[PDB]
Design a protein around this ligand. Structure first.
Ligand SMILES: Nc1nc2c(ncn2[C@@H]2O[C@H](COP(=O)(O)OP(=O)(O)OP(=O)(O)O)[C@@H](O)[C@H]2O)c(=O)[nH]1
Lengths: 66, 67, 167, 138
C-alpha cells in the first residue's frame, strides 16, 4: 500500500490525453497548477481547463482540438 | 530517491510503474485510465493525476516512505 | 515553562502562527520559509511554552523525530484552505501518533485550521471529518479554526491547551 | 418572507464581507462569508447561550401574558366595556401574470396565519401553487 489515495471523482468529464495535459507553475509562489486542453465529451467542443487543488477554476473555449 | 521509472496505463483497470525490468507499485482503478501525469502538482513532489476512460479524476499522492 | 511541539506541513503557517503569539513589542515583522531548526518562546495566560520552528518541506520532515521526547503537547496547524494535501496531513498525523513515544503518553493536542479567512477553506467539522480525528481515543484533542494574520482564534486555542495541561 | 432592503459590507466580525437583508416582518438578517462551526473536538456554545436567553425570556413573558390574559378574560364580562381589536398589516399584491391568464394573489402578515377565507362573487378557479404549503377545503 505505497500509493496514498487523495481524490476519486467520476463527474469530472476530463477526456484529455497523456500529452495534452501538463502541470507547472502558473502564478509563481510555488503553487503548481495543471493545464489541459480537454476535448468535448465526444470530441466536438475543444475546451482548455486548468486545475488548482481539486476544484475547477477556469475552463474556456478553444478554437480547435489541442 | 532518484527513481525515474516509466508508467503504464493498461486497459485491464490497473496501472503498473515499470523500472528497467521490474514491476512495482501496481495500482487499481474503478475504470481503465487513459492519461497519467506525475509531478509537483499542488505542493507535493510526488503527485500523480490520472483520468478515467469514461471521465472523472483520480489524484494519488505518493508517500515519501516508499494424475 | 512547558515544552510544546508545533507541527505543520510546508507553507501551512507555522512561523506566522507562533509569531502572532509573541507579545506586542517582541513580536517580529517579516515571515520567511524556515530552514533547519530554531527556538521560539511564547507566553500563554498562566504558562509559557516553547516551540522549535522547523521547515515542513518534504525532505526536511524526518527531523520531526528529534524533538518527540521533550514534547508535552502537540500543536498541529493545517491549511484549512488546502484541500489537496489534506490526506497528506492525515497520514502525517497517523505516522506521528503511532510513534513509540507519542503512542501512549496521553498528551493534549491542538489542531489549527489556519487561514480561516480564505474563501476556499473548510469549516472545522468538515476538516475533522476528512482528517479522521476519531481514530484517536487516547488523547483529548481539540481543533480550532484561526486566521494567523488578524490574530483571531489563537487565544482560545492556547487557553484550552493550558486548561487541559493543568487539569 | 419578502425582502425589503439589501446592503453589502460587514456588520459582524469585521474582516469578512457580508450581505445585510431587511425582512418584511423586521428580521434584519445577515449572510456572512465566514464559517460558523470554526471549532470542535471529541465533544459550539453560542447555541446554548441563545437557547438559555430565549428560555428565560419566554418563561417571564409567559408569566406576564398569562396573568394579563386572566385579567382580560375576567374583565371582558364588564357590560359597558368594549373589546378593542389588534390592527395589523397585510402586504397584498393582486398582480396579473402575463405568460398565463391568472392573477397571482399574495398575502403577507408579520406573524403567522391560521386560516384564510376566499369568498367570491365570480366563477373563479383557484389553482395550486407548489410553493404554498397550505391545505384547501372547497
Ligand atoms: N491569508 C492568510 N495567509 C496566511 C495566514 N497564515 C499564514 N499565511 C501566509 O502563508 C504563510 C503562513 O506561514 P508559513 O510561512 O506557512 O509558516 P512557516 O512555519 O514558515 O511554514 P513552513 O515554511 O512550511 O515552515 C505566510 O507566508 C503568509 O503569507 C492566514 O491566516 N491567512
Amino acid at each position: 500500500s505505497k500509493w496514498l489515495d487523495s481524490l476519486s471523482d467520476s463527474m469530472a468529464n476530463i477526456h484529455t490525453f497523456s500529452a495534452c495535459l501538463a502541470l507547472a507553475d502558473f502564478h509563481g509562489d510555488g503553487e503548481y497548477k495543471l493545464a489541459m486542453g480537454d476535448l468535448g465529451p465526444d470530441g466536438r467542443q475543444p475546451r482548455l481547463k486548468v486545475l488548482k487543488g481539486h476544484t475547477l477554476v477556469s475552463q474556456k473555449p478553444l478554437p480547435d482540438l489541442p | 530517491r532518484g527513481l525515474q521509472a516509466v508508467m503504464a496505463a493498461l486497459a485491464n483497470e490497473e496501472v503498473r510503474i515499470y523500472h528497467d525490468k521490474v514491476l512495482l507499485n501496481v495500482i487499481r482503478t474503478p475504470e481503465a485510465v487513459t492519461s497519467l501525469c506525475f509531478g509537483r502538482y499542488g505542493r507535493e513532489d510526488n503527485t500523480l493525476i490520472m483520468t478515467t476512460l469514461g471521465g472523472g479524476l483520480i489524484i494519488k499522492i505518493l508517500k515519501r516512505t516508499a494424475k | 515553562e512547558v515544552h510544546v511541539l508545533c507541527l505543520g506541513l510546508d507553507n501551512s503557517g507555522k512561523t506566522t502562527i507562533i509569531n502572532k503569539l509573541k507579545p506586542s513589542n517582541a513580536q517580529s515583522q517579516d515571515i520567511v520559509p524556515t530552514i533547519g531548526f530554531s527556538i521560539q518562546k511564547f507566553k500563554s495566560s498562566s504558562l509559557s511554552f516553547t516551540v522549535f520552528d522547523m521547515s515542513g518541506q518534504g525532505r526536511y520532515r524526518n527531523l520531526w523525530e528529534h524533538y518527540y521526547k521533550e514534547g508535552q503537547a502537540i500543536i498541529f496547524v493545517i491549511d484549512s484552505s488546502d484541500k489537496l494535501r489534506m490526506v497528506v496531513a492525515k497520514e502525517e498525523l497517523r505516522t506521528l501518533l503511532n510513534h513509540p513515544d507519542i503512542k501512549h503518553r496521553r498528551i493534549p493536542i491542538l489542531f489549527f485550521a489556519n487561514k480561516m479567512d480564505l474563501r476556499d477553506a473548510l469549516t472545522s467539522v468538515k476538516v475533522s471529518q476528512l482528517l479522521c480525528l476519531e481514530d484517536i481515543k487516547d488523547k483529548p484533542w481539540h481543533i480550532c479554526a484561526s486566521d494567523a494574520i488578524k490574530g483571531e482564534g489563537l487565544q482560545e486555542g492556547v487557553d484550552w491547551l493550558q486548561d487541559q495541561i493543568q487539569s | 418572507e419578502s425582502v425589503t432592503s439589501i446592503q453589502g459590507g460587514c456588520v459582524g466580525k469585521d474582516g469578512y464581507d457580508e450581505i445585510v437583508v431587511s425582512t418584511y416582518s423586521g428580521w434584519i438578517t445577515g449572510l456572512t462569508t465566514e464559517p460558523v462551526h470554526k471549532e470542535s473536538g471529541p465533544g459550539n456554545q453560542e447555541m446554548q447561550n441563545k437557547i438559555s436567553s430565549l428560555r428565560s425570556e419566554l418563561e417571564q413573558l409567559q408569566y406576564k401574558v398569562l396573568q394579563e390574559r386572566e385579567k382580560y378574560q375576567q374583565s371582558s364580562q364588564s357590560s359597558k366595556a368594549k373589546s378593542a381589536v389588534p390592527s395589523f398589516s397585510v402586504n397584498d399584491k393582486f398582480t396579473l401574470n402575463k405568460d398565463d391568464a391568472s392573477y397571482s394573489l399574495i398575502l403577507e402578515v408579520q406573524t403567522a396565519i391560521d386560516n384564510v377565507l376566499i369568498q367570491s362573487d365570480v366563477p373563479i378557479d383557484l389553482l395550486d401553487v407548489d410553493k404554498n404549503s397550505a391545505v384547501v377545503s372547497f
